[PDB]
Amino acid sequence: ATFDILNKCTYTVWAAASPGGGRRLDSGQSWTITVNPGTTNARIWGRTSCTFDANGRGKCETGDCNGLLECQGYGSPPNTLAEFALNQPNNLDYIDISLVDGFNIPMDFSGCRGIQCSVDINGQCPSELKAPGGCNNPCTVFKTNEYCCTDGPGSCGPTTYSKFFKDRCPDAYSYPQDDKTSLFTCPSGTNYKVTFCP
């Protein structure tokens, strides 16, 4: 599948992908990548307030991936995520926006349907969850089963903190087991667009 990733934010977003790497996107810029069928565990995000040297090493305020421009692994929360797994059984791609590793930049993820989390989550973030440049999920910050769902299927459910996210972005995962209303599929062969600040 192809992914067009577009920055419509008024500020530079250093886009990142696992797998795929990373690119500086100033306002209005785009980066198109191919992710092969069968890839699972994949994600596209944006990073704010980065600084990189001529070799691409440095540090981002949000979403930092081991201090590289061209990521080779996941970023540090808080980071809004476009998650996907391609060509799964019955020729299905499974897509979602997740807030389980936090929020940093508003996002639209579109394929056979549009998913969008665009409200001002940073401006409204509870003080328990605030981070520089974003809003953490309570699971990242408070490590208990109530928010992290480690104790098995059905052992957790929505909390006051996850409802903060879900009330604002009903279609994105707000806690780890938030699948019924956050996990979507498209037919394999669909191509995708991820847009920052839609």
Numbering used by the authors: 25 to 222
Question: How is this structure described in the published paper?
Answer:
Despite these low concentrations, proteins have a great technological relevance in winemaking as some of them, the grape pathogenesis-related (PR) proteins, can aggregate to form a visible haze. Among the grape PR-proteins, the thaumatin-like proteins (TLPs) and chitinases can undergo changes in structural integrity, particularly under certain conditions such as when wines are exposed to elevated temperatures during storage or transportation. In this paper the crystal structure and some physico-chemical parameters relevant for the haze formation mechanism of three isoforms of TLPs isolated from grape juice were determined. Plant TLPs generally have three domains and a cleft located between domains I and II.
Despite sharing the same sequence, the two VVTL1 isoforms, I and H2 exhibited differences in their chromatographic behavior, a feature that allowed their separation and that also indicated that they possess some differences in physical properties. The physical differences between these two isoforms of the protein were also observed during crystallography. Although similar, distinctly different conditions were required to obtain crystals of the two proteins. The crystals of H2 were much smaller than those of I, hence diffraction data for these crystals were collected on the micro-crystallography beamline (MX2). Data were obtained up to 1.5∶Å, however there was a noticeable decrease in the quality of the last 60 images collected (out of 240), likely due to radiation damage, obliging us to cut the spot recognition to 2.5 σ, thus limiting the resolution to 1.65∶Å. The comparison of the two structures performed with the algorithm for protein structure alignment and comparison named TM-align tool indicated that the two proteins have a root mean square deviation (RMSD) of 0.78 Å, with a TM-score of 0.98, indicating that the proteins belong to the same fold (thaumatin), confirming results previously obtained with CATH. Differences were observed in loops between helixes α4 and α5 (loop A), between α5 and β13 (loop B) between β7 and β8 (loop C), and between β9 and β10 (loop D). These differences relate to alternate conformations of the loops between the two structures, rather than differences in the lengths of the loops. The solved crystal structures do not provide an explanation for their different chromatographic behavior, and this remains a topic for further study.
